[PDB]
Each structure stands twice: as structure tokens, then as C-alpha cells.
Coordinates of C-alpha atoms and ligand atoms in Angstrom, one line a residue:
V1 CA -78.6 -38.5 73.0
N2 CA -79.9 -40.8 75.7
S3 CA -82.0 -44.0 76.2
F4 CA -85.3 -42.4 77.3
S5 CA -88.0 -43.4 74.8
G6 CA -91.6 -42.3 74.2
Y7 CA -91.5 -39.0 76.1
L8 CA -93.5 -35.9 75.1
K9 CA -91.2 -32.8 75.0
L10 CA -92.9 -30.1 77.1
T11 CA -90.0 -27.6 77.0
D12 CA -86.4 -27.2 76.1
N13 CA -85.5 -29.4 79.2
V14 CA -88.7 -31.1 80.5
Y15 CA -90.0 -34.4 79.1
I16 CA -93.1 -36.4 80.3
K17 CA -94.4 -39.9 79.9
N18 CA -97.1 -42.1 81.4
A19 CA -94.9 -44.7 83.1
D20 CA -94.1 -46.4 86.4
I21 CA -90.7 -44.9 87.5
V22 CA -89.6 -48.3 88.7
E23 CA -90.1 -49.8 85.3
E24 CA -88.4 -46.9 83.6
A25 CA -85.4 -47.2 85.9
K26 CA -85.0 -50.9 85.3
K27 CA -85.2 -50.5 81.5
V28 CA -83.0 -47.3 81.2
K29 CA -80.6 -47.6 84.2
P30 CA -80.2 -43.8 84.3
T31 CA -77.4 -42.0 86.0
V32 CA -79.9 -40.5 88.5
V33 CA -83.4 -41.7 89.6
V34 CA -85.2 -39.3 92.0
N35 CA -87.1 -40.8 95.0
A36 CA -90.1 -39.0 96.5
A37 CA -88.6 -39.3 100.0
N38 CA -89.8 -38.2 103.4
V39 CA -87.4 -36.6 105.9
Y40 CA -86.8 -39.9 107.7
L41 CA -86.0 -41.9 104.5
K42 CA -88.7 -44.3 105.5
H43 CA -89.6 -45.8 102.1
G44 CA -93.1 -47.1 102.9
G45 CA -95.4 -46.3 99.9
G46 CA -95.7 -44.5 96.7
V47 CA -92.6 -44.0 94.7
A48 CA -90.4 -44.6 97.7
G49 CA -92.0 -47.9 98.8
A50 CA -92.0 -49.1 95.2
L51 CA -88.3 -48.2 94.5
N52 CA -87.2 -49.8 97.7
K53 CA -89.2 -53.0 97.0
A54 CA -87.4 -53.2 93.6
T55 CA -84.1 -53.1 95.5
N56 CA -85.1 -55.9 97.8
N57 CA -84.9 -53.5 100.7
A58 CA -81.2 -52.5 100.1
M59 CA -82.3 -48.9 99.7
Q60 CA -83.9 -48.9 103.1
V61 CA -80.8 -50.6 104.7
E62 CA -78.6 -47.9 103.2
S63 CA -81.0 -45.2 104.2
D64 CA -81.2 -46.2 107.8
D65 CA -77.4 -46.0 108.1
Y66 CA -77.5 -42.6 106.5
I67 CA -80.1 -41.3 109.0
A68 CA -78.3 -42.9 112.0
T69 CA -75.2 -40.9 111.0
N70 CA -76.7 -37.6 109.7
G71 CA -80.2 -37.2 111.1
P72 CA -83.3 -36.3 109.0
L73 CA -83.3 -34.3 105.9
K74 CA -85.0 -31.0 105.6
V75 CA -88.4 -30.6 103.8
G76 CA -87.2 -29.2 100.4
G77 CA -83.8 -30.9 100.8
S78 CA -82.1 -34.0 99.3
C79 CA -79.3 -36.4 99.6
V80 CA -77.5 -38.6 97.0
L81 CA -77.3 -42.3 97.8
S82 CA -76.8 -45.4 95.7
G83 CA -79.2 -46.3 92.9
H84 CA -78.7 -50.0 93.7
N85 CA -80.0 -52.1 90.8
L86 CA -82.1 -49.3 89.3
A87 CA -79.7 -46.4 88.5
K88 CA -76.2 -45.3 89.3
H89 CA -77.4 -42.9 92.0
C90 CA -80.7 -42.2 93.8
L91 CA -81.4 -38.5 94.6
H92 CA -83.8 -38.7 97.6
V93 CA -85.8 -35.4 97.4
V94 CA -88.3 -34.3 100.1
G95 CA -91.2 -32.4 98.7
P96 CA -93.7 -30.9 101.1
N97 CA -96.4 -33.1 102.4
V98 CA -99.7 -31.1 102.3
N99 CA -101.2 -33.7 104.6
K100 CA -98.6 -32.8 107.2
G101 CA -99.3 -29.0 106.9
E102 CA -96.0 -28.4 105.1
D103 CA -95.5 -25.2 103.1
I104 CA -96.2 -25.7 99.4
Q105 CA -93.6 -23.0 98.7
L106 CA -91.0 -25.7 99.7
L107 CA -91.9 -27.5 96.4
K108 CA -89.8 -25.0 94.5
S109 CA -86.9 -25.6 96.9
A110 CA -87.3 -29.4 96.4
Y111 CA -87.1 -29.1 92.6
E112 CA -84.0 -26.9 92.9
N113 CA -82.1 -30.0 94.0
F114 CA -82.6 -31.4 90.4
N115 CA -80.3 -28.6 89.0
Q116 CA -77.3 -30.3 90.6
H117 CA -77.6 -33.1 88.0
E118 CA -77.4 -32.9 84.3
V119 CA -80.0 -35.5 83.6
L120 CA -82.6 -37.2 85.9
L121 CA -85.5 -39.6 85.8
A122 CA -88.1 -38.3 88.3
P123 CA -91.6 -38.5 89.5
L124 CA -93.9 -35.4 90.0
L125 CA -92.8 -34.1 93.4
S126 CA -95.4 -33.8 96.1
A127 CA -98.1 -35.6 94.0
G128 CA -99.8 -38.8 95.0
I129 CA -99.7 -39.5 98.7
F130 CA -97.9 -36.2 99.4
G131 CA -101.2 -34.4 98.8
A132 CA -100.3 -31.5 96.5
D133 CA -101.9 -30.5 93.2
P134 CA -100.0 -32.3 90.4
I135 CA -100.8 -29.6 87.8
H136 CA -99.1 -27.2 90.1
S137 CA -96.2 -29.6 90.6
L138 CA -95.6 -29.8 86.9
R139 CA -95.7 -26.0 86.6
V140 CA -93.1 -25.6 89.4
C141 CA -90.9 -28.2 87.8
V142 CA -90.9 -26.5 84.4
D143 CA -90.3 -23.1 86.0
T144 CA -87.5 -24.3 88.4
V145 CA -85.6 -27.2 86.8
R146 CA -83.0 -26.2 84.2
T147 CA -81.3 -29.5 83.7
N148 CA -82.8 -32.3 81.6
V149 CA -85.7 -34.0 83.5
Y150 CA -87.7 -37.1 82.3
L151 CA -90.9 -37.2 84.4
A152 CA -92.7 -40.5 84.9
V153 CA -96.4 -40.0 85.7
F154 CA -98.0 -43.2 86.9
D155 CA -101.7 -42.5 86.4
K156 CA -102.8 -42.3 82.7
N157 CA -105.7 -40.0 83.6
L158 CA -103.4 -37.6 85.3
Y159 CA -100.9 -37.8 82.4
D160 CA -103.6 -36.8 79.8
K161 CA -104.8 -34.0 82.1
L162 CA -101.2 -32.6 82.6
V163 CA -100.6 -32.6 78.9
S164 CA -103.9 -31.2 77.8
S165 CA -103.8 -28.3 80.3
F166 CA -100.1 -27.5 79.7
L167 CA -99.4 -23.8 78.9
Ligands
LIG1 O1 -97.7 -40.1 88.9 C1 -98.8 -40.1 89.4 O2 -99.9 -40.4 88.8 C2 -98.9 -39.6 90.8 C3 -98.6 -40.7 91.8 N1 -97.4 -41.4 91.3 C4 -96.7 -42.3 92.1 O3 -97.0 -42.6 93.2 C5 -95.6 -42.9 91.2 N2 -95.2 -42.2 90.1 C6 -94.4 -42.8 89.3 N3 -93.9 -44.1 89.4 C7 -94.4 -44.8 90.5 N4 -94.1 -46.1 90.8 C8 -94.8 -46.4 91.9 C9 -95.5 -45.3 92.4 C10 -95.3 -44.2 91.4 C11 -99.8 -41.7 91.8 C12 -99.7 -43.1 91.4 C13 -100.8 -43.9 91.4 N5 -102.0 -43.5 91.8 C14 -102.1 -42.2 92.2 C15 -101.1 -41.3 92.2

């Protein structure tokens, strides 16, 4: 049993809700919130910009120290950092940016990072400003993630479309 409320169960392990991930995180305080990161951990917009804003920029300060020490992430890769006031941990995951020419096959690799955590609150990877097809992202999620994932879809129109077209 956990504190996630109002989700539709899609499969044994995937749950979906029309919600702002920032508001879900503040309410639930999950063990792991997933950030839709870029390789530089520059949290400017979308999920990342909004999460960072909700930490009063502490996420960005921590991230800049991480990059100064370790260099950029790989597309399809991840790192675990603090969840600040939003979660115990933040799993920063880099999905491919279709607007950067990045290989959509890396979306599966990106979702594989979720399997290192028993339960996660997450956005739809590579959706929104990353330019990928969100219907495809949900399918890859369902076919890749085996741990328990609670997906927060911001746009109600998209949520309704993802549910109604789900096989
Ligand atoms: O979930 C979607 O609808 C895709 C994408 N989502 C996000 O950017 C997104 N998803 C979940 N919590 C969020 N909080 C702030 C942004 C954010 C989108 C948000 C709006 N307008 C267009 C796309």
C-alpha cells in the first residue's frame, strides 16, 4: 500500500493520472520522483524547470556541482540526486530529444533506469518539449518498466487520448 491516489491502473505495474508532477510530489513526498533531464542537468523548462522552481533552485545548485565533478550524463542515462522538498530522491533521466536529432531507440534505455527503483513517480519520458510521440512513450514505458511506476500526465487532452487508445 502507498499514498498515490486517483490513478488508473493500466497494467500490473503501471498507473496513470492527469496531474502536475510537482503537485503530486508535494502531496505524496514519494521515495523517488523522476525528472525529465537533459544531459547538462540544466533545468530550464518543462518538468525540470518546474521541479527546480519548486525547490527554490536548490536542485540546480546541486546539479551544477554534480556536472562540475562528473561531466554530462548520456542520453538514455540517469543519476540519483536529492529530492529536496519534493521527494527523498530525484532520479534525473535523460530521454532522447527528437528536436536534437537523438535516436528514439534511446527511449527504452531511458526507461530501463526506472527498474533500479521499486516505486517511482514519473512523467512521460521524451514527451512535451522533448518532441517525441507520447502514445509511443507510454507504450515503451509499459513494455520496459517492471517496477511500480505512477505516471503524471499534465495535459488532460493527452491523458484522455492515452487512456482511450491503450491496448
Ligand atoms: O504530460 C504531458 O502532458 C506532457 C508534457 N508534460 C510536462 O511537461 C509535465 N508533466 C508533468 N508534470 C509537469 N509539471 C510541469 C510540467 C510537467 C506537457 C505539459 C504541458 N503541455 C504540454 C505538454
